[PDB]
């Protein structure tokens, strides 16, 4: 089971890789923006940072204004050249899908994003996308429940033996990671702080204090 | 998992194949009618369109008036000759089944249609039909629930290791496609618009707009 | 349990009332458009058609461009004057809700529409809307399942004793009507043909033929 | 997999085999009676009709008056000689079981019938019966529910890897066939009319009419 | 069913009351801090803002350092005097509970907070607290599931006919509000933006645009 | 709804009453023993401690050697005289039940204990016992599951409108209290420490510390 | 909830009434036989034993050979005269039902027995029988499962507000009593030994011994 | 899959083997007592009765007074010598388990009995007992439900791939056998009469009569 | 399947190994304290006691004050040297995990403890810990239910084919052991008395007494 970091902050990515054994990285125009840096600079820093590393995907989203497959494929190919770690994040639209279909035919890995239902998830798999990214958070913000549709996607993918790997996305806490693990999603992608806190629990603190007292009442060096 | 187009409009079929990777095509006398064109011309256009393609079924339904296996087999064989992509759509009637039994014995692939229950679905499988097409929409229109009977058919087929492939039919939206995928149906057949919209979701639009704004506030070169 | 007609075609509405005992009517800018007639003409025809009847709601949607409660309330009040059967259909937006809150305070019945989740459904009830209209069809078209969220709304409303009545909307077949009946929704709203076919069943035809033979013997 | 015809009417059996691909036949003193013809004549007609067809069982029930295993085995052996397609239908009684145990030891296939519970179904399997026939209809007539006990039998058989094949019996409609298919029963046995109608549905008729109109407009 | 605002920002509280018909307000030392203002100033502004209004609770948390019921009761009484809308937020500790017991005996309403299990929720109810506040968010952050324990609390309270009202707390989205509504919780408390967004949905936007197009093709006036 | 203290330590009982609003007390020969005091002294201290208090049952178990109803009733009546708060704890045995039947006829409240199944729970209710005490802990120690049998008892009592109140007993933690609350048991009885800790949770500590930091940056 | 004794042994009935507060008695030709006495003697002993008692049914089964309603009604009326406690146990047959229908019209209480399915249970209720007795044990002996059909009967009776009271019959252990209590059956009928043992549990014995030790270490 | 006879009456055991294909035998001090014969005589008769037969376990319970593993192992070894069909029934006590552990190390098959919970069942499996015998009847007599704990044991054994075979014990009817079959218990052990009746059903009688009438109308 | 003893009392460990076939040992600073002996003496006694035994893990917890991976790894390596049976118990903290990651890279087995949720359990598995120890008791003391989160962990581990073995910890009775067995947890760790009593049941005692009477009458 794979943990990807949904961030564009290189220092977050460095720490995660070294200490958490993150299995890859996801970005989008919003995360790129909040990096403070320009797009091609972020990309360049990434290229260099992971020149060596062999099976470590970095999902990078093409200009969202694009409204036609031809242009989509052009701009994405440019980005692909920049590093073999890069995967092309692409919206689940009529052109988006057509473009992904082509990208994958040409052996360029894609990540279809802005998926919100199992029917939306099906087509990426049917065109042999390397990654599909179904969203939780935005739906929940509006009062929609997500647990069924995510489970459905996983079951469907397993049932029809599709290779496409599911990245559960827009996650905001540990419980949600667990939901996905229970569902059997291939991958999960979360902000730095989400993962950090998913490791920490008040009972651990409580436990340490119990044990510190006990140690302080033991002869610890005969 | 297989997506078939339930349409007779060649332009719809062309787009679907090129962009959606549809895995085949279903027709019926109503879709043939609404094509505007005559039957054997539709068939001819299809024959030529897919002369090349090897594993791409086109289900073509024999005249609904025919009321006897002998005639059914005659008329269907004629249609089969016209192209090796064609499969013979045949109603789930007493003669219909007998005809399919024979067609398949003679190595002509059939698609038993107008199936509405699992008991109706069983016999096609027992005769080694290549396809069975159970219906959702028409039942739902009259207030019947379909989800159990479809699931039952799939489970039955899997359980007794039949080769017959299930084409869930008379679908009208994405949710229903998903229901079938969850059930494990082999195939689904839908109109052009159904599939098109099954790929589109309001949250995607919402997402794009978020992202367009973000891009417009980033230095992209 | 109430059946409303989601149409703006007066002839459909006439037949429904006379033969199906429809309990009211829903409209929206799309149905108004497809009437062929202009808005205030449709409204006028309705006003006259039901001048007498006092217990028969007709939901009529204000201009969707409006982006402010003040204007919303103005335009809707105008429409309310035209007939006491009219209910003011209003989108579930921040201004939409504020407007409904006011309309209802002033004793003008509202129908909050374009509701797609239970959290969206809650606020209309909290503001004392006469009707809330959660949608099925558009969600299903995009692959979303609706059965839970509709059931949830009903349970929530019953549980907290809100008087707001649920109109399950964007329906397309009989099964879906039944889903709502099973859920306990107050109201359902459907096109003419949906209802017509929800009454008809192939086994009935089959049965008649059995019985015709028996009679003729 | 596995439709048997519960009839003694040879014309029904002929049609079924040729057109429905029935996988075998079950009979019973009641069906034999209502054939009109006498037992050994019915059997003879069957012997000739098939013998030579390889794996097509015809279940034929020994005299129900018999009350001792010794006699049961004698009379059944006689019937077995008449054709190797015949299987010996035998009631689930204390002697019945003892007889089946012996029949199967001697390589004569049996069908233990008048089974109404899973405990009754177990012993036939434990003695290596070729067929067990649990009943639905008669129980339902008296208000008993059957769906659990049938499911239980199937699960039990699968779970303990018994070769004995289940013939769900005393069926009266298509829904019930489906119940058994869902349960995973090996075999089902039904009257001619049951099967015939299990293939027909009012929506098909309705559909044909839609389609006839459409055809007439091209 | 009651919506409370979990904020100390007066402008948020004003808007909510006027437009959302919020039924009350919750605060805690963290929200007080992030107000920018000092505690007794925030309190004073509140007192004045709602001088008139009856049945509108404002939950205000006593100093968390306090480790003894005697002091707790002293400091809280002081706060209670400041306004009859105020409710005394109190941690679920051994002294916390003892203090609440006394406060309620003296007819001063309390809100027991930092409740994380049904056993913790029981004692406040057993002491006749006006409010108990069980937490969702912090638990979920550490990987704990909350839906059962919240449901349990509600069922328990209903089953033993306690008047104590449940305020589901540390909420972050609309789905979670719905979970609580389904559970039958009396009250929910959320930040401004949570509520705002719980009213908005991408399908509404999509719907408006459909309808705007339709209107633009209609002769209205 | 009701919390009883399963202890014979007076100081524990005092604190519980004053701070936790315990609704009553349960004892048994084991708790009496571990009090350190003699039986009739414990009882006397209780009598005096709660002379006033009107709705506060104290369950006190008769000698477990007794094997006949006649003697059981004699010894228990003696104990009942000592205080009107006292309830007579009695094992779920053939004589035990017969004795309870009589005690209740004579208007002396009983608590049938050492109940381990719903069939055992039924008869106390059928004889109009004031309390029945089904056990959790000892069963679980041997690997038996208890959740169904407790739920069953509650449902049965509610369904047939028995007055007898259920005291879930031999409890060891908060989760178990909650199980009983979910089941709808009338009463629960727990050791001092169980209740104390059932009120405390590591997330509360964590919360306080968050808030202490916030307070220290305010005002 | 009612416990009836399924016995014809008067000494069993005496003990049960005095100590267990049994709410009535059921009999059948097999129990009558194993009494050692003749039918009319058993009946006479019962009549006298409960001359006083007003609300205490004794179910007494007419000759099973009878094959016609007219005779059934005659013989049962004779038995009814003998005591107002008696209820007429009657098989669930075509004549059986017709007879019960008449008996009840004439205000003579009946108990329809040898009921094995809910459809069989329905008709007694539809004719206003005072008691219906569905059977568990004999079905289970042959491998049939009973839990559904009993639950179904209860739900059906409650749902359509029939007065007829359900006596779950041919019971053989405590678990089965509990099953019926869970189902909400009105009445249960069991042998002496069944009830006796339904009140005992090994953990109680274990508990007593723990407590005896504790008592022996207390002043 | 396996039916064992819980009896010490040799005539019952003979009939069962010959006609029911019983797969083995269980005994205990109570059944030995009710045989009428003395212990070592019963054992001797058994030894001789099955000298030949290869795979047919006979469970024989050591003196229940024993309170120590040393003695348990001594007395059981003595019994084992008497016949290789014998399995040593042993109570689920602290000494009981220790003894079984040793018996099995020494290649002597044991049957741990008086098991009433899954935790009790686990340790026998953990020490490689050939048989564990969980009880139904005595629990039910006191109002305890058994179906969960039995299912749990089976699932646990399957899940952790233990070889120990489960003998569901203290059974009294057919339904209970079925419960165990549904659960997937390896073995069941019942009195003669229980099994006998588990094969018979009122609907079979009813069926025979229908069929006798039909036969009588040739 | 695997029973570990959560104790530091050598005599308890000896008895358990010899009679219960315990599969290993867990300790923590509290158990070390309540041993009465000093830490490095306890460790030494263990080292010697199990010098031979090859597949027998002994979990030993490093100083809980440590607040950095570097120091953690240093102190743990020291302990590892002392015996190849020892596993390094480590709290589920940010440094704790980083340290475990390193320990395991260096081929030193770790046991991540003070795990209270599935998200906490995931990371140890993701870093290839040999053992994770999720806690039941302390949660239940505060009124939290644990059954789901334990089941979730097991299902998650199985589903993503992690080798890390789950030690359900802070158990206090037999029922809880069974819960874990039902869940499919790899390992369980319990105090001496818990296991002892998990083998004893009042019905066994009751059974013995029945049987003693019966034996005394032959």
Swiss-Prot record, chain C:
<keyword id="KW-0704">Schiff base</keyword>
<dbReference type="GO" id="GO:0005975">
    <property type="term" value="P:carbohydrate metabolic process"/>
</dbReference>
<keyword id="KW-0808">Transferase</keyword>
<keyword id="KW-0119">Carbohydrate metabolism</keyword>
<comment type="similarity">
    <text>Belongs to the transaldolase family.</text>
</comment>
<dbReference type="InterPro" id="IPR013785">
    <property type="entry name" value="Aldolase_TIM"/>
</dbReference>
<dbReference type="GO" id="GO:0004801">
    <property type="term" value="F:transaldolase activity"/>
</dbReference>
<dbReference type="Pfam" id="PF00923">
    <property type="entry name" value="TAL_FSA"/>
</dbReference>
<dbReference type="InterPro" id="IPR033919">
    <property type="entry name" value="TSA/FSA_arc/bac"/>
</dbReference>
<comment type="function">
    <text>Part of the sulfo-TAL (or sulfo-SFT) pathway, a D-sulfoquinovose degradation pathway that produces sulfolactate (SL). Catalyzes the conversion of 6-deoxy-6-sulfo-D-fructose (SF) and glyceraldehyde 3-phosphate (GAP) into fructose-6-phosphate (F6P) and 3-sulfolactaldehyde (SLA). Can also catalyze the SF-cleavage with erythrose 4-phosphate (E4P) as acceptor, forming 3-sulfolactaldehyde (SLA) and sedoheptulose 7-phosphate (S7P).</text>
</comment>
<dbReference type="GO" id="GO:0016832">
    <property type="term" value="F:aldehyde-lyase activity"/>
</dbReference>
<feature type="active site" description="Schiff-base intermediate with substrate">
    <location>
        <position position="89"/>
    </location>
</feature>
<dbReference type="InterPro" id="IPR001585">
    <property type="entry name" value="TAL/FSA"/>
</dbReference>
<protein>
    <recommendedName>
        <fullName>6-deoxy-6-sulfo-D-fructose transaldolase</fullName>
        <ecNumber>2.2.1.14</ecNumber>
    </recommendedName>
</protein>
């Amino acid at each position: 089971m794979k943990y990807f970091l949904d961030s564009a902050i290189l220092e977050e990515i460095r720490y995660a890789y070294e200490n958490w054994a993150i299995d890859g990285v996801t970005t989008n125009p919003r995360h790129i923006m909040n990096s403070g840096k320009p797009f091609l600079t972020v990309l360049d820093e990434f290229a260099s940072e992971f020149k060596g590393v062999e099976n470590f995907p970095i999902s990078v989203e093409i200009n969202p204004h694009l409204d036609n497959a031809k242009d989509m494929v052009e701009e994405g190919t440019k980005i692909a050249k920049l590093s073999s770690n890069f995967v092309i994040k692409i919206p689940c639209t009529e052109p988006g899908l057509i473009a992904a279909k082509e990208f994958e035919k040409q052996g360029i890995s894609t990540n279809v994003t802005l998926v919100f239902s199992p029917s939306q998830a099906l087509q990426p798999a049917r065109i042999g996308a390397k990654f599909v990214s179904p969203f939780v958070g935005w739906k929940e913000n509006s009062g929609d429940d997500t647990t069924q549709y995510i489970q459905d996607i996983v079951n469907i993918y397993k049932n029809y033996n599709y290779n496409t790997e599911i990245i559960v996305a827009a996650l905001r806490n540990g419980k949600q990671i667990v939901d996905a693990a229970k569902a059997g999603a291939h991958i999960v992608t979360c902000g730095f702080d989400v993962y950090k806190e998913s490791f920490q629990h008040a009972f651990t603190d409580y436990g340490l204090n119990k044990f510190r007292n006990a140690w302080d009442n033991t002869v610890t060096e005969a």
